[PDB]
């Protein structure tokens, strides 16, 4: 695929493929010439070297290094370990309806509450604004609703504020050790780019207000709204599963 800069970029597989096809076609040429066997031998050894390098480069011998003196990424490599498809691009995913930001204290909040910035929740609940907008008849179509949101007009804040009520949001902190590493709350819109978290559940995340960031996630489906309120709500999660002991405890 071509870069914006007029450059192109190719995967190392294409490069490894050209090694296989070149040598294979050169063998077809040498079998046409009925060349002496000593040469045919090298060609067959080469062909194998290329095929084995295509399937799993770094294994039989030296992995074929390329341009930046680094080894070419083969097929097996995209199925192999952390950096493979499994762990990196299948079990682990970057996810929509997600935002992260510096957290700060919320000593005014109740346990089932958390400060959510307005401009964060704005972008997060984008399809829910366009939906409630067509219902009121303020938007006739969706690109009309898109511009209504963009202009940040006064009456759009009040609609955003409508959908968010009675709607839980997931708050995650890295790293996710135990299940309590995510808890759900009822978002409270606050003017400011900082998330405001409940002091007592700080224990579960191990979240120190010394510059921590927490990922936000919006539960889309009604089932996810029920799951977030039933299972993942902060009030329904008190005691640790490890020990029948309260993790929600002042400090």
């Amino acid at each position: 695929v071509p870069l914006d800069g007029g450059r192109f970029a190719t995967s190392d597989l294409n490069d490894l493929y050209r090694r296989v096809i070149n040598r294979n076609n050169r063998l077809k040429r040498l079998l046409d010439l009925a060349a002496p066997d000593i040469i045919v031998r090298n060609e067959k050894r080469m062909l194998q070297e290329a095929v084995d390098a295509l399937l799993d480069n770094g294994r039989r011998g030296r992995a074929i290094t390329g341009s930046n003196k680094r080894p070419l990424k083969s097929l097996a490599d995209m199925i192999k370990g952390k950096q493979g498809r499994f762990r990196q691009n299948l079990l682990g995913k970057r996810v929509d309806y997600s935002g992260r930001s510096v957290i700060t204290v919320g000593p005014y909040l109740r346990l089932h509450q958390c400060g959510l910035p307005k401009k964060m929740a704005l972008e997060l609940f984008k399809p829910f604004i366009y939906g409630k907008l067509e219902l009121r008849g303020l938007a006739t179509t969706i690109k009309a609703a898109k511009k209504m949101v963009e202009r940040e007009e006064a009456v759009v804040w009040d609609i955003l504020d409508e959908v968010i009520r009675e709607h839980p949001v997931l708050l995650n902190r890295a790293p996710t050790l135990h299940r309590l590493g995510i808890q759900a709350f009822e978002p409270v819109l606050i003017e400011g780019k900082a998330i405001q978290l409940h002091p007592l559940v700080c224990a579960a995340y191990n979240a120190d207000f010394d510059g921590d960031q927490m990922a936000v996630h919006v539960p889309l489906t009604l089932e996810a709204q029920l799951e977030a309120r039933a299972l993942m709500m902060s009030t329904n999660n008190i005691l640790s599963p490890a020990n029948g002991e309260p993790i929600i405890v002042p400090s």
Partner: protein
Amino acid sequence: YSYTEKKRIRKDFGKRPQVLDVPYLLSIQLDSFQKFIEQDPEGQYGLEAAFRSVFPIQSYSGNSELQYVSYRLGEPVFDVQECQIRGVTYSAPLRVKLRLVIYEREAPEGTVKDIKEQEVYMGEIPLMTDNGTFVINGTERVIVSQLHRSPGVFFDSDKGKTHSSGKVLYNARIIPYRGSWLDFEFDPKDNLFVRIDRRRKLPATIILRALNYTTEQILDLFFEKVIFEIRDNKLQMELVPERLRGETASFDIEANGKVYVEKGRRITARHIRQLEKDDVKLIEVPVEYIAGKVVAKDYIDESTGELICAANMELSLDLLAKLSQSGHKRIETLFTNDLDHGPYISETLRVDPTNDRLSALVEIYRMMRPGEPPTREAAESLFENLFFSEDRYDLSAVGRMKFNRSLLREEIEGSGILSKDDIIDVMKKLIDIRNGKGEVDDIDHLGNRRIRSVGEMAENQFRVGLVRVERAVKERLSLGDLDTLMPQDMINAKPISAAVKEFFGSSQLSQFMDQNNPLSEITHKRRISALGPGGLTRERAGFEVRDVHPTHYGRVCPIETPEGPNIGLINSLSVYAQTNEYGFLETPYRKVTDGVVTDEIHYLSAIEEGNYVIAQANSNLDEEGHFVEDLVTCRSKGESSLFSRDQVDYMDVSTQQVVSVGASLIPFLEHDDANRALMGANMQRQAVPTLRADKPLVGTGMERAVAVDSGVTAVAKRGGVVQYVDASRIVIKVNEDEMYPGEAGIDIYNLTKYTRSNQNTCINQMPCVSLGEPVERGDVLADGPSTDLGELALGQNMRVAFMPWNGYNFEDSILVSERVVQEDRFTTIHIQELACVSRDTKLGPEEITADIPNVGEAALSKLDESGIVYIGAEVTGGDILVGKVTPKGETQLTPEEKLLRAIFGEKASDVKDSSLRVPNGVSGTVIDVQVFTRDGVEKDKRALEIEEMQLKQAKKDLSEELQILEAGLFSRIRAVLVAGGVEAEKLDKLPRDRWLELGLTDEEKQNQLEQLAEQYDELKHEFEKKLEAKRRKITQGDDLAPGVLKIVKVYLAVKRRIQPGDKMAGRHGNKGVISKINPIEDMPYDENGTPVDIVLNPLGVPSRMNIGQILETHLGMAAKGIGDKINAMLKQQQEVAKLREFIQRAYDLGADVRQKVDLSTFSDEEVMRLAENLRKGMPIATPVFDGAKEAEIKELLKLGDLPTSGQIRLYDGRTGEQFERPVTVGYMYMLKLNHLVDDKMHARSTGSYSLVTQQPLGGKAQFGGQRFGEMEVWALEAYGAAYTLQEMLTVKSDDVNGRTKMYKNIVDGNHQMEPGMPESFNVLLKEIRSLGINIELEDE
């Protein structure tokens, strides 16, 4: 004391007078690169070395050859000013003279046949600034000094390779600067092995055979000799009394007359002196004793001529009798000892399957090139090429030095190649350590970790350029015609240029300067790393490397290193630390002569530190004499204890040499845990400079030193009176004594005005001097972005109070007043640079006009006709900075768009849109715009308006240069003319253009008038070509990437205010997020009324153990107490004498204050300019370890009429009622870290998608969703929440059907689960099929 110091003096609580003044902190970087360019005549260093090393190069036939003559540096094409802006390397032309000499073939060596000679370019080398930076592609970048294992020899031992045996296997290893590795290692059976390049394991006698050593010679080298004489019938044996030592008498030991030891008895030191004094030489012994002993040399039967027994063969009774009757009654055998002189080479030869020299070179060849049939030359060439060729191998100076002093040798300086001697000497000391004597070296000792600065590394990379040219020279010389081919046709300039830019870009050590703070610049140039090429790796890195080693003392800082996986490897250099001439580190030390602590200083190497005993700086001098106490706490041999006076040999110079720059700025570090001290010094580097530079009330003194040496300020080259002050520049008139008699003598300092940083922050230089002020040489004339009267100003001090506040300071959370926000004091500047690129697509060229399709008149309001936003125009996310349009191809206007473009008309022509618009969310003020155009296609009208300014501004700027330079030049002539022909007004009648017309008598001053007259003309002619260079480089088309036609670079200027989410900290590692900006109504306040600025949590203190912050607070309050008293007297408008008494009483309070500043010396006018700067608060210096103690701080608090305690009666602002009990209040110098929330927060609903995984991208950089990793997944599995997970696996990530389908369902209101199956899995199916595996989805 100086003038700039007279304006504001810092009260110093030091009691250890500085015998050594803090050096220039950027010593290493500047001195290192200085060596690299330095064309040394003989003592090759840098480039001169690189040429003499590789050159002369000769053809593969050896009939023609290329010889190096001399090289030179041309002045830079573009200077720093220009380079920083355009965006190309600040480099100098490399012109090297080459000489092509060709010999006659049949003739001996016809050297004089064609001595061709010419000069040739190859590559442009990035130069170093005066700041110690490299401008690469318009970025001042810093190359970090590397820390690597020093070449030479090194003895190690895996204390249990096989814990099966649990045997400490000792090994030796010869580490060269260039060449192959040479290791020697034992094994469970103590057989010596050699492993070149750590390849195959080969018996260690095979390498000796290769050096032509017969079995006999080998044994004769290592083992001693035992003589056996067979006299008549009695077998006899030579005894050195000191041999049967710590062994058992296996036989009856009896002499000329006496039985000493009985059978089966230990021979003690008594029995050894018994025999040694009796002068015993010969002893009669049994023949059963030799059974086991190894014969030394060969023994042929004199009679037959056959070997009765070969060398190195265990004797027996029958072999000994065969030797007695052969006719040998003098036998030589090995002195084998299982305890001391060990038999290793002996047992090794029994394993060794080789035979002679030539066969030993075979297995050496069969190791490294296995499969190639070996010849006499191939086997010999390889081995000789390894450690014995001037080409392949080079230990270097440090290599041979460490190699020699490791073998306790004779030479410091010797040969680059390994000699036979060297190899065996190394095997010998390995075997010494194995025996018992000799200690192994440890790698963590800095005596083995050498430092390699940029200049040495630039030299190395410059060699590979020469090596890669060597290839192209030789092959072109041999087959190419001799005569025709010129030397530059065979040279290539790209391999050198590419290999050097490889270093100045891709290398781990070449990284973008962290210049978001003077401290960041200076500590990042003083960074030293063990990583990158030829070093270590997080993957490879152990613990003992990272651990602080007692060698670090005075050399490296114990508390300066990232807390990340790159923790112990990266390290800043110590304050007074410096590089050894060879490579190691060295630290200053006061020599003690005959008890007397002499002021003579000696920088002791890492090696010699261990030798002498070194007293600590805590020790008390007797004011020119010796240590006051008889006993002195000192340290040596890497340990610490008390010693007597005469036993002390050296002493720590200052008390600050243990620490680095980063740590020398922390006050009361002595009262801070090392864990929080580290974080504190790490965050002090992250301190973004504020709007108004506020000096620190609670400093160390090092403040000024940092600000000045950082090269961010502008300090005076020559002292005199500031002829002119200006915001843009400074003009100073030099005094007669300093001013040169040749030139005019008026220095020019054009101060760097607001422009961007590598971290997108402000850079300004404001004049810190008044118009027409007398200034001394080396005084700060303009302050930097984070400096104040030359002292460092990183953050701002404020009244702080430690107490909880309704949990708004919960876990280190910060509660800041609105009054801080009102003063806009922590409000920061952020200069952001955005660019607009006109490219050449397949469809056609792009341009830059105001004509943009699908736009509002509102968007094109801030643009001009050319299509660039006005200077000073406020902009916001969505507004367009620069109008761009690209070609639109065959475009399928969809029916719904063809109808919509037909209804609202506006039939847009063949053109697209890609105008550079302010990124959604940013908003600031455009401060400047710069246009780069290729040499060709005609220009924008705005690009012409900018050319107008550059030119007419340069014409003015150069007019101003020649004008003020003229005035300073005639100012001299005017003074010269008076000396001799004294006439005042009559001389000043006619104009000044006819002054060179007037002269003087035959005198030195007549020659002076001729100098100034022809130098005035020299400037008059110079002015034209100075104008030419400016004019051309403005008309010149700036060379761009292929495809690009022109570029427009915009500079915004954002003013972000502090807000909840912003991260701030002290310098004691006390972190915190601002949680709430409290109303001024709600802020606590003292009885007197002034409110508190920040309210910190007291619980962020005990657990932390960083009590330095509390002392910072107390002293800051005391310091302010004094400023508050001075503020009151200056407001009351009292008197000069009243201020004098109080201020003299303030400066003189400490026990033994270092500075004793008398104010009787200060004039009345000098006192009031001082007091005026003291009113914000008397700035105090608390040296790192020689800081102020409670006795001094509480005494200062009594001067300020502050409480001894430091706790004040506070009242709650919300209410008005008092708090239940007193709270600590004072001024803590806090900082605003770069981790600002506006640069953190992110949000996404739906946006971009990945290329193959088809899941969203990553980061707010590319607008990507947060990653939900497997750990995040298991959490929902535990909850039971199944849809919430499936929702985050499919619709929110890959599921292409799901994501769009779900979107449409949400806007409908029906939040309904509609899964399908992520693409990333559908990929995994085909990926396993591409690997030749049948993976299909078997159905129900």
